[PDB]
């Protein structure tokens, strides 16, 4: 399952456009995919640890929010 | 027995003093909680909420809308220096980004 | 008729800074999240809210990183962002 | 069903006090509730640390005031401090 | 002329276990004591937050283990966990 | 009565288990504290202390010195990836900096 | 009192040399002085607040340590 | 005579090997007292407090100068410029 290619080049281009980037090099996409994979790996590992400590089997939104707060990226909108 | 009146009504607030006191007691913060701490905390929370809601309502009125959406909250937070500093490391869902473009990229 | 290069880019910059939607398709991101989580636990279920929160956090992080990368690229008297800018921004930020 | 306490009605009352003719959506309500919870937790944790530093075992209004002055930046803090006093004194009068 | 508890003797015992013929200065002792206090506070706070999240009133070995796994990075954490487990097992045996 | 044996000796540790238990109970962390938590915490603290002390002693030995000074502690911390990650936002007094010169500025 | 000028040019040069800087422009000393003044102002304000809460007139090292720690700048070796 | 860049490299090697403070103690103490005079009057400072402030300031400045050197090298330069300091501070989130 090579789903890291699901983050298509137009999606990364749109994300850069929201950030104010006017011209994008052709090698940006692979680096962006790697960075996204690393960030997701860290957050998901923390969330899975939180879920496993609770003896559950579903990763709830509270676990993701707590993991993001642990990394220092407090997210408003989901849970409390 | 005299008619019961809430502590928030005594202090002239809108936030619950009793609920804040219960949260402070059950939150494992300190062994004892003074009687004036919940009032202070409720007043501070109400002031902050009123400020941010006033800014968001101003933004919504400037956008010709009669309902507050997370975009308005994000605009209100980011347009105020003190609120931006307070919420510097906080992500608001469905907030977007502040519209700006570097002067270098603009054509001459 | 054909617009000169950089015009549609500025139009897209102005358009995507006014909207608040998600710029990544939901199904590919959900599949990626499930595949990544497969390496930690087997037969894991995901709430929709969890996937949505992950998507929002990832999009915000990538947008901030791209802003910093654009600043780095402009600093070097350039307009095109390159992987060196991303690496420098990540190094300075402490990652 | 188990009741879920939240800062929903109070935020709406404050909004009606400020903007009598403006509503608020569910997502904005959740964001407001999360913001209130986060600020409450930050102030309470700072007050607890302040109480522990001075070898005292009681959270008073002075600890909350110092925590507010430490956390809230600039003019905001000052205004907040005033509001705090403007409440406590009133609570003493009754 | 009051008692001031510190992690001075225990650090020296560990150092003598590791390097029997190496001494330690006062500044290094202060740094080690501060490091021990900081790590203890971090782990205890994370365990308390974990217990509060799951509506539990008790801090047990599971909470400490999960806090160690969350805080300590890399193989370090794993090794630490092993040590802790062994200790608990020994404390159960006698 | 039976002779008093310290909980640290029973678990084979050197860090105090009773002191850690007292700090956990008096530290306002939770309403109740289990009997196995202090042992786990003391074991983790002892392991981390042994690791950092061994690294500092190795640095001092490689520096051809006997005692341990904060410079050796900084050298031990900054040269280990996991320890550097753990103490990422920590400043050690009289520790100096790791020798690092960029190759661009080299002649 | 213009003691902000007490941080001399050779001191800033030494600080840059410790950081690996080879060449230094002459227009960065003022920027470094301003940055140092801002950082000191923030830390000292927090320390003075901590001291004032304790009803003291002496700024102890523990207050400075707490002020540094609350900004994510934990300092080891002073308590 | 030594060509430019040699004594600078020698100083870089020397100051990266020592652990001594690089700012004179008395001027720094005077500056700290001047800054603290604004928040309160007739304040007393322990020597340990001033030492801790000096150590923290020196570490912060050294880290900032390392980031500034990285920024300058990125722009294909050797000379540190104020714009590099400003960019490093903006990216780190201090002046942002």
PDB file of C-alpha atoms in Angstrom, chain F residues 13-98:
ATOM      1  CA  UNK F  13      17.672   0.168  43.813  1.00  0.00           C
ATOM      2  CA  UNK F  14      19.845   2.934  45.243  1.00  0.00           C
ATOM      3  CA  UNK F  15      17.518   5.893  44.744  1.00  0.00           C
ATOM      4  CA  UNK F  16      15.113   6.306  47.681  1.00  0.00           C
ATOM      5  CA  UNK F  17      11.705   4.720  47.211  1.00  0.00           C
ATOM      6  CA  UNK F  18      10.261   6.181  50.407  1.00  0.00           C
ATOM      7  CA  UNK F  19      11.318   9.718  49.512  1.00  0.00           C
ATOM      8  CA  UNK F  20       9.890   9.352  45.998  1.00  0.00           C
ATOM      9  CA  UNK F  21       6.624   8.043  47.453  1.00  0.00           C
ATOM     10  CA  UNK F  22       6.454  10.976  49.876  1.00  0.00           C
ATOM     11  CA  UNK F  23       7.134  13.454  47.066  1.00  0.00           C
ATOM     12  CA  UNK F  24       4.416  11.875  44.913  1.00  0.00           C
ATOM     13  CA  UNK F  25       1.893  11.946  47.766  1.00  0.00           C
ATOM     14  CA  UNK F  26       2.730  15.501  48.879  1.00  0.00           C
ATOM     15  CA  UNK F  27       3.192  16.807  45.327  1.00  0.00           C
ATOM     16  CA  UNK F  28      -0.547  17.101  44.597  1.00  0.00           C
ATOM     17  CA  UNK F  29      -0.462  14.774  41.584  1.00  0.00           C
ATOM     18  CA  UNK F  30      -3.432  12.500  42.318  1.00  0.00           C
ATOM     19  CA  UNK F  31      -5.791  11.629  45.150  1.00  0.00           C
ATOM     20  CA  UNK F  32      -4.192   8.200  45.651  1.00  0.00           C
ATOM     21  CA  UNK F  33      -0.794   6.747  44.755  1.00  0.00           C
ATOM     22  CA  UNK F  34      -0.229   3.055  44.142  1.00  0.00           C
ATOM     23  CA  UNK F  35       2.385   1.000  45.943  1.00  0.00           C
ATOM     24  CA  UNK F  36       4.315   0.158  42.770  1.00  0.00           C
ATOM     25  CA  UNK F  37       4.575   3.645  41.290  1.00  0.00           C
ATOM     26  CA  UNK F  38       7.461   4.848  43.531  1.00  0.00           C
ATOM     27  CA  UNK F  39       9.509   1.750  42.668  1.00  0.00           C
ATOM     28  CA  UNK F  40       9.016   2.312  38.935  1.00  0.00           C
ATOM     29  CA  UNK F  41       9.855   6.012  39.222  1.00  0.00           C
ATOM     30  CA  UNK F  42      12.976   5.333  41.297  1.00  0.00           C
ATOM     31  CA  UNK F  43      14.152   2.682  38.834  1.00  0.00           C
ATOM     32  CA  UNK F  44      13.679   5.043  35.880  1.00  0.00           C
ATOM     33  CA  UNK F  45      15.499   7.862  37.683  1.00  0.00           C
ATOM     34  CA  UNK F  46      18.384   5.567  38.630  1.00  0.00           C
ATOM     35  CA  UNK F  47      18.695   4.280  35.062  1.00  0.00           C
ATOM     36  CA  UNK F  48      18.785   7.791  33.601  1.00  0.00           C
ATOM     37  CA  UNK F  49      21.287   8.973  36.217  1.00  0.00           C
ATOM     38  CA  UNK F  50      23.535   5.974  35.561  1.00  0.00           C
ATOM     39  CA  UNK F  51      23.412   6.608  31.809  1.00  0.00           C
ATOM     40  CA  UNK F  52      24.307  10.297  32.046  1.00  0.00           C
ATOM     41  CA  UNK F  53      26.981   9.698  34.697  1.00  0.00           C
ATOM     42  CA  UNK F  54      28.606   6.932  32.643  1.00  0.00           C
ATOM     43  CA  UNK F  55      28.667   9.147  29.553  1.00  0.00           C
ATOM     44  CA  UNK F  56      30.158  12.047  31.531  1.00  0.00           C
ATOM     45  CA  UNK F  57      32.791   9.783  33.069  1.00  0.00           C
ATOM     46  CA  UNK F  58      33.713   8.455  29.635  1.00  0.00           C
ATOM     47  CA  UNK F  59      34.070  12.032  28.385  1.00  0.00           C
ATOM     48  CA  UNK F  60      36.297  12.927  31.345  1.00  0.00           C
ATOM     49  CA  UNK F  61      38.415   9.811  30.788  1.00  0.00           C
ATOM     50  CA  UNK F  62      38.846  10.680  27.105  1.00  0.00           C
ATOM     51  CA  UNK F  63      39.777  14.223  28.200  1.00  0.00           C
ATOM     52  CA  UNK F  64      42.518  12.750  30.444  1.00  0.00           C
ATOM     53  CA  UNK F  65      41.015  14.056  33.689  1.00  0.00           C
ATOM     54  CA  UNK F  66      39.782  12.496  36.927  1.00  0.00           C
ATOM     55  CA  UNK F  67      36.894  14.602  38.249  1.00  0.00           C
ATOM     56  CA  UNK F  68      33.637  15.477  36.487  1.00  0.00           C
ATOM     57  CA  UNK F  69      32.912  19.099  35.572  1.00  0.00           C
ATOM     58  CA  UNK F  70      29.875  20.659  33.856  1.00  0.00           C
ATOM     59  CA  UNK F  71      31.803  20.756  30.573  1.00  0.00           C
ATOM     60  CA  UNK F  72      31.931  16.951  30.624  1.00  0.00           C
ATOM     61  CA  UNK F  73      28.190  16.779  31.317  1.00  0.00           C
ATOM     62  CA  UNK F  74      27.496  19.085  28.369  1.00  0.00           C
ATOM     63  CA  UNK F  75      29.771  17.006  26.132  1.00  0.00           C
ATOM     64  CA  UNK F  76      27.999  13.808  27.193  1.00  0.00           C
ATOM     65  CA  UNK F  77      24.520  15.260  26.644  1.00  0.00           C
ATOM     66  CA  UNK F  78      25.175  16.957  23.304  1.00  0.00           C
ATOM     67  CA  UNK F  79      26.954  13.950  21.756  1.00  0.00           C
ATOM     68  CA  UNK F  80      24.068  11.505  22.361  1.00  0.00           C
ATOM     69  CA  UNK F  81      21.060  11.745  20.053  1.00  0.00           C
ATOM     70  CA  UNK F  82      18.430  10.519  22.518  1.00  0.00           C
ATOM     71  CA  UNK F  83      19.849  12.515  25.433  1.00  0.00           C
ATOM     72  CA  UNK F  84      20.099  15.630  23.255  1.00  0.00           C
ATOM     73  CA  UNK F  85      16.458  15.179  22.244  1.00  0.00           C
ATOM     74  CA  UNK F  86      15.432  14.753  25.885  1.00  0.00           C
ATOM     75  CA  UNK F  87      17.388  17.829  27.024  1.00  0.00           C
ATOM     76  CA  UNK F  88      16.622  19.930  23.970  1.00  0.00           C
ATOM     77  CA  UNK F  89      15.602  23.139  25.761  1.00  0.00           C
ATOM     78  CA  UNK F  90      17.983  22.802  28.723  1.00  0.00           C
ATOM     79  CA  UNK F  91      20.962  25.074  29.401  1.00  0.00           C
ATOM     80  CA  UNK F  92      23.848  23.666  31.447  1.00  0.00           C
ATOM     81  CA  UNK F  93      25.868  26.272  33.329  1.00  0.00           C
ATOM     82  CA  UNK F  94      29.582  26.421  32.461  1.00  0.00           C
ATOM     83  CA  UNK F  95      29.018  23.872  29.708  1.00  0.00           C
ATOM     84  CA  UNK F  96      30.324  25.719  26.683  1.00  0.00           C
ATOM     85  CA  UNK F  97      29.285  24.611  23.207  1.00  0.00           C
ATOM     86  CA  UNK F  98      30.014  21.656  20.964  1.00  0.00           C
TER      87      UNK F  98
END
